[PDB]
Design a binder for this molecule. Structure first.
Ligand code: ZN
Length: 372
C-alpha cells in the first residue's frame, strides 16, 4: 500500500532479510530480478516469471527508448500494461548500455549523445531525460542517471567520473521530484561510484546520503575487477550506505557472487546470466552449472536438477532438453530459461530462510562446497 517501505525482518552479520512494500507489490529481500530487455523476459510469459517466484523484474531503458520508444509505450498505457507484468518493475537509467552498445558516444556535463546501434540514432540522454523516460515507462523503482567508471581506472579518472555522477545524482533527484505523479508513486535509487578507492566511495556515499534516496546501488563493480576485488570493495563500501535502506548490486548474478554479496549486506541483484545461459545450453544446478549440449546427457532421464521444484524439472528430462537445444528448438530455450530463473529464485529463498534462521553462514559454506 505505501509508496515505498523497507523493513528488515532478520539479520546475521552484515546479511539481512526483509521486505520492500510498494504500491504494486511486496518484494522479498535478498531479491533477484530477472532482466526484461525489450519489454520481455526472454522466452517467458509474465505469468511464468511470476511462477518461478520473482517479485520484481528489471526493464532496460536503453532498448525501450529506441524500440518501441518511451513515448509510444506511455501512449499505450505504460510498460506494465504493455508487457503484461502487473508487479513492480525497476528500470535502469540507460547510461550503462549507451556506453556499451551505442555508436559514437559523446560525453559532456549535460549528458551523453549517441547513435542508436540499429537505425540512425535516437540520441540524447541526460539525467532529466533519463528520469522522464523512466516516468513515461511508468517504472516503480527509478535509477538515477550516472557515469560508470571503466576498469581499470586511475584515481583522478575515477574521481572526476564520480564527481560528475554526484552532480547528476542531484539532477536526477530534482527531475524526479518535479514530477509529482512520479514522486508519489515511484521510488528513486542513487548509485555510489568511486571505482575501487574507498576514499572516493566514501565521498560518493556521503554526497548520496546528503541528497537522500529510497535505496542505494553500489555501481562500478562487475566490470572486470574479479570477485576478490569486488568483495574487497563491498567490504568497505556497503557499510558506507544507510543501513535502513535497500542496497542494490547492479549487474551481479553468478550464484557464488550473490552469496558472497549477501554476506556483505547486499539486498538486491539483477543480471542477464540465467536467461542468457539458458539460450546457450547452460543450466544451473546445486552441483554447479552443466552444459546440456554435451553428449553425456543424451540419454539422461534425470531432470536438470533433482532438487529443483520448477515445472521444467517436474516434467522433462535432461535427454529431452539436450535434444531440443542441439536441434535449436525454441522450446529448448523456453525450458532452460524457466529452470534457470527458477533456480535463482530458489537460491534467494534459501538465502532468506537461512538468514531468518540464523544459519546463513553455514548455508553459504555448504553451498560453496557443493556448487564447486
Ligand atoms: Zn528446474
Amino acid at each position: 500500500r505505501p509508496r515505498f517501505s523497507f523493513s528488515i525482518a532478520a539479520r546475521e552479520g552484515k546479511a539481512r532479510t526483509g521486505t520492500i512494500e510498494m504500491k504494486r507489490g511486496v518484494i522479498r529481500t535478498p531479491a533477484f530480478m530477472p532482466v526484461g530487455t525489450a519489454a520481455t523476459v526472454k522466452a517467458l510469459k509474465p505469468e511464468t516469471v511470476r511462477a518461478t517466484g520473482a517479485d520484481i523484474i528489471l526493464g532496460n531503458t536503453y532498448h525501450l527508448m529506441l524500440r518501441p520508444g518511451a513515448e509510444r509505450i506511455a501512449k499505450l498505457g505504460g510498460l506494465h500494461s504493455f508487457m503484461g507484468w502487473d508487479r513492480p518493475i525497476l528500470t535502469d537509467s540507460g547510461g550503462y548500455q549507451v556506453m556499451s552498445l551505442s555508436s559514437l558516444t559523446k560525453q559532456s556535463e549535460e549528458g551523453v549523445t549517441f547513435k542508436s546501434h540499429l537505425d540512425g540514432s535516437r540520441h540524447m540522454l541526460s539525467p532529466e531525460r533519463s528520469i522522464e523516460i523512466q516516468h513515461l515507462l511508468g517504472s516503480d523503482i527509478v535509477m538515477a542517471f550516472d557515469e560508470c567508471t571503466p576498469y581499470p581506472a586511475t584515481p583522478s579518472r575515477a574521481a572526476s567520473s564520480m564527481e560528475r555522477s554526484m552532480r547528476w545524482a542531484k539532477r536526477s533527484r530534482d527531475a524526479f521530484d518535479s514530477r509529482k505523479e512520479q514522486a508519489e508513486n515511484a521510488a528513486l535509487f542513487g548509485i555510489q561510484q568511486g571505482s575501487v578507492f574507498e576514499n572516493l566511495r566514501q565521498q560518493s556515499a556521503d554526497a548520496l546520503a546528503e541528497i537522500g534516496f529510497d535505496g542505494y546501488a553500489v555501481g562500478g563493480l562487475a566490470v572486470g575487477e574479479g570477485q576478490d576485488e569486488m568483495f574487497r570493495v563491498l567490504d568497505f563500501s556497503v557499510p558506507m550506505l544507510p543501513d535502513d535502506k535497500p542496497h542494490y548490486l547492479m549487474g551481479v548474478g553468478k550464484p557464488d557472487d550473490i552469496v558472497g554479496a549477501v554476506e556483505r549486506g547486499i539486498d538486491m541483484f539483477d543480471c542477464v546470466l540465467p536467461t542468457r545461459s539458458g539460450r546457450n545450453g547452460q543450466a544451473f544446478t546445486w552441483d554447479g552449472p552443466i552444459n546440456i549440449r554435451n553428449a553425456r546427457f543424451s540419454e539422461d532421464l534425470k531432470p536438470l536438477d533433482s532438487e529443483c521444484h520448477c515445472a521444467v524439472c517436474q516434467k522433462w528430462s535432461r535427454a529431452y532438453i539436450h535434444h531440443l537445444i542441439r536441434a535449436g528448438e525454441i522450446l529448448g530455450a523456453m525450458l532452460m530459461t524457466e529452470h534457470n530463473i527458477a533456480f535463482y529464485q530458489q537460491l534467494m529463498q534459501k538465502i532468506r530462510d537461512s538468514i531468518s534462521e540464523g544459519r546463513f553462514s553455514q548455508f553459504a559454506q555448504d553451498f560453496r562446497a557443493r556448487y564447486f
